[PDB]
Structure formats: structure tokens, C-alpha cells
């Protein structure tokens, strides 16, 4: 639909501008001239501004000869100082070309956006190769991941090839027929889940840039990826269920909950996810419900929050000490959000916190300790590496009740 609704008319400004500016008959603009503008070793951005700003006035039928010069020079557009207007205009022209030649254009753009370490790095990517493995379109130059106008293009190609692989697999299944439907459906679901997981890993603030979260390229890339994931979750909520059963890093959880409006359906399978045998699934379910209760304060959200509190209270008495540490260190900050969303949960959360703290003080008393937190029972409010896990868990309990009291007082 995104490749079709762009053809819908708005106000007649484009036909007017075409009629008033394309009649200048300055026919110097050509794929050869634009290629010479790109291929200048002392590259000038002004000339390519002039050419592609003229190109925006062209119709989609007459923008066909510029497809090769527009695609094959996209590697130069990532070269650390290309102006944002060049990238936006190239994205606009690619979106225009997507309406008349998308099957060729996706192949040319995938071949253009390779890392190109080798001489070709498999420039022979055909349409069949991309329909077989749609995740090829995520093996780009890796500088595109902070280039939002090229994230728009690569997300368009990713969504297109993910849609095309379903038809390709159905065609191959019917051709080789001369069960396998279940295996095809499992392959498709795992393929979409893998695409979502790779997209979420693109959203992560990688450690090269870690050492202003709103006015960065990462924010725009996160918004584009969140829009694509919203569309894909609407198209198939089972993909969202499969992805959240697989799980992603919890740093992405506030971003996914805030940026994807179709994340409220995760409350349907969070009761199912919290019953999973693996501890990581329960940790991720509690951490996901933590942000979902802040985003959506539903009565059913309160019911699932009560369920999660009961699950944590039961896992306090089921898990061993190492498992108690590994489970309660990530899930303790979720109780602050549970108390923020649901003030009726204060009694249950505080009784649970008393139980966890009194359990965790006992095995502190069991072994000799390097810092002995039992003596430090009279400590003031502290300011917001090789320590013992039990003492770390005790300090986590104290920190979580500090945040709960600070939140409820305010």
C-alpha cells in the first residue's frame, strides 16, 4: 500500500511545478551528465543538487534511464558529509522509481548497497536470490544503519522481499509437488521473526557510538524501523508473538513499546510467555509487561500484572540462590512500573519485596561477606563490581523500594 498510496494526488502542485519548470528545455541533464557529476574525484555537491532537483520534476515513466546512475552511486552518498537534502531527494526519486520499476530497482539497489570490500562481493544477486533469502537486503554497507533516507529504501526492499518470498515458496511448493505446508509456514514465520530481530538489533546503540538520543540519526532509524514493525505486526500478530517468545534485548523494550502502537496485543500472550520453562522468557515477559502497563493501564493489564506478581512470588520459593539472583536482578525494576501503573498493587508489591529481602538477607547471613549489609541496616538514601551476588541482590531490593517510595511520594 505504501508503494501505491504515493500515487494518490494531493493538491496539483507537482503537475504545476512540472509544467512551469520542465519546459525550460535545458537538456544537459542526462544519466551521463549525472554520472560525470558523481564520478568527479573532487566531488561537488552543488552540481548533483542541481541535477537531482531537476530530476524531481520528471515523471516516473521518464525517470527510467536515471535508475542506473541513481542506484549505482548510492555508496558515495554515505561518505561522511553528504548533505541531508541530497539523501532526501535521492530517497524521493527512488520512491518515484519504485512505482514503475520495483522488481528491477530492488535488485539494482541491493547490488549497489553492498559493503564492496571485494571487487564484486556478489554483485550477481538476482531477483531469485533475494526471493530465496530476503535477509540479504540486511547485509548492506553498515553505514546505511545511520542513514535514514537509505533505511527507508532498505526497509521498503525488505518488506517487499519478505512479501515476495511467500509467493516464491508457494510457487516452488506447487511446482515441486508434481506436511510440507507446515514446514513452509514454519520457514516463513521464522524468516519474518529473524527479519524483525535483525531490525531490532539495528536499533541498538552500538558500542562504537556509545563511547543526543533525540536529535541523532539513530532516532530516525529507530522510528522508521518501528513503523515497519508496526505494519508487520498489523499484517501478522503471530509474528509479534513469535518475536516476543524469541525475545530481544531489554534496552529495546521502551523503544518498542512507545514506538510501535500495536504492542498492546502482547498482553494476550504474556500470560502464555510467563509460563515458559526457560527463565529468560519469564524475565523478558515481566520486563515487557513492565513497559506495557505504563503505556496501557487496562483492567486486563492489571490482571496480568497481578499474575506476574504471583509468578515472581512463586519463583522466589522455586528457584535456587543463583537462579534467584539471575531472575530477580533484571525483574526488580519492573515492580516500580507495576506500582506506577497500579496503585492497588502496593500491598502485593511491598509484601513481595519484604519476602525477597528477608530471603536474600538469610543467605547473606549464611556465608561470610566482604561488606556485610546486615550491619548497614541503618543507612540513609544513597545517591542514584566484584561484589557478592547476594549483597548485590539486597542492594537491588533496597534501590527498588527507594524508587517505589520516591515515585509514590511524588
Amino acid at each position: 500500500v505504501d508503494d501505491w498510496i504515493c500515487e494518490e494526488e494531493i493538491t496539483g502542485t507537482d503537475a504545476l511545478l512540472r509544467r512551469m519548470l520542465l519546459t525550460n528545455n535545458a537538456k544537459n541533464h542526462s544519466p551521463k551528465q549525472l554520472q560525470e557529476a558523481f564520478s568527479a574525484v573532487p566531488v561537488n555537491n552543488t552540481q548533483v543538487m542541481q541535477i537531482i532537483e531537476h530530476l524531481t520534476l520528471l515523471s516516473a515513466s521518464e525517470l527510467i534511464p536515471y535508475a542506473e546512475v541513481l542506484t549505482s552511486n548510492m555508496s558515495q552518498l554515505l561518505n561522511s558529509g553528504v548533505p541531508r537534502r541530497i539523501l532526501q531527494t535521492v530517497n524521493k526519486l527512488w520512491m518515484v522509481l519504485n512505482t514503475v520499476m520495483p522488481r528491477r530497482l530492488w535488485v539494482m539497489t541491493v547490488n549497489a548497497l553492498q559493503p564492496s570490500i571485494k571487487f564484486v562481493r556478489q554483485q550477481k544477486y538476482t531477483q531469485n536470490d533475494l526471493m530465496i533469502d530476503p535477509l540479504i537486503v540486511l547485509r548492506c554497507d553498515q553505514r546505511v544503519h545511520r542513514c535514514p533516507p537509505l533505511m527507508d529504501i532498505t526497509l521498503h526492499m525488505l518488506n517487499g522481499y519478505l512479501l515476495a518470498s511467500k509467493a516464491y515458496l508457494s510457487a516452488h511448493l506447487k511446482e515441486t509437488e508434481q506436511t510440507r505446508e507446515e514446514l513452509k509456514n514454519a520457514l516463513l514465520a521464522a524468516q519474518d521473526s529473524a527479519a524483525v530481530q535483525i531490525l531490532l538489533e539495528i536499533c541498538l546503540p552500538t558500542e562504537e557510538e556509545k563511547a543526543d538520543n533525540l536529535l541523532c540519526n539513530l532516532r530516525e532509524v529507530q522510528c522508521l524501523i518501528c513503523c515497519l514493525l508496526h505494519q508487520m505486526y498489523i499484517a501478522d500478530p503471530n509474528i509479534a508473538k513469535l518475536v516476543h517468545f524469541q525475545g530481544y534485548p531489554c534496552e529495546l523494550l521502551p523503544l518498542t513499546v512507545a514506538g510501535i502502537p500495536s504492542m498492546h496485543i502482547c498482553l494476550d500472550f504474556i500470560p502464555e510467555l510467563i509460563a515458559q520453562p526457560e527463565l529468560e522468557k519469564q524475565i523478558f515477559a515481566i520486563q515487557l509487561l513492565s513497559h506495557l502497563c505504563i503505556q496501557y493501564a487496562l483492567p486486563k493489564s492489571l490482571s496480568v500484572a497481578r499474575l506476574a506478581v504471583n509468578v515472581m512470588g512463586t519463583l522466589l520459593t522455586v528457584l535456587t540462590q543463583a537462579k534467584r539472583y539471575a531472575f530477580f536482578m533484571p525483574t526488580l525494576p519492573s515492580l516500580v512500573s507495576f506500582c506506577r501503573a497500579f496503585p492497588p498493587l502496593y500491598e502485593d508489591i511491598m509484601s513481595l519485596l519484604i519476602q525477597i529481602g528477608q530471603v536474600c538477607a538469610s543467605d547473606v547471613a549464611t556465608q561470610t561477606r566482604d561488606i556485610d549489609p546486615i550491619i548497614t541496616r541503618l543507612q540513609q538514601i544513597k545517591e542514584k563490581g566484584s561484589m557478592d551476588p547476594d549483597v548485590q541482590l539486597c542492594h537491588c531490593i533496597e534501590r527498588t523500594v527507594i524508587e517505589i517510595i520516591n515515585m509514590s511520594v511524588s
Binding site: 498489523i234 500495536s262 498492546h264 496485543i265 496501557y296
Partner: peptide, 13 residues
């Protein structure tokens, strides 16, 4: 439904 917010107005036929 994933296409509608939980706080969105309900549709009554």
C-alpha cells in the same frame, strides 16, 4: 485487534 488502541472508541453496529 492490533490495528486499534485499547483506549480507542468502540464500534457499535
Amino acid at each position: 485487534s492490533p490495528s486499534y488502541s485499547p483506549t480507542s472508541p468502540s464500534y457499535s453496529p
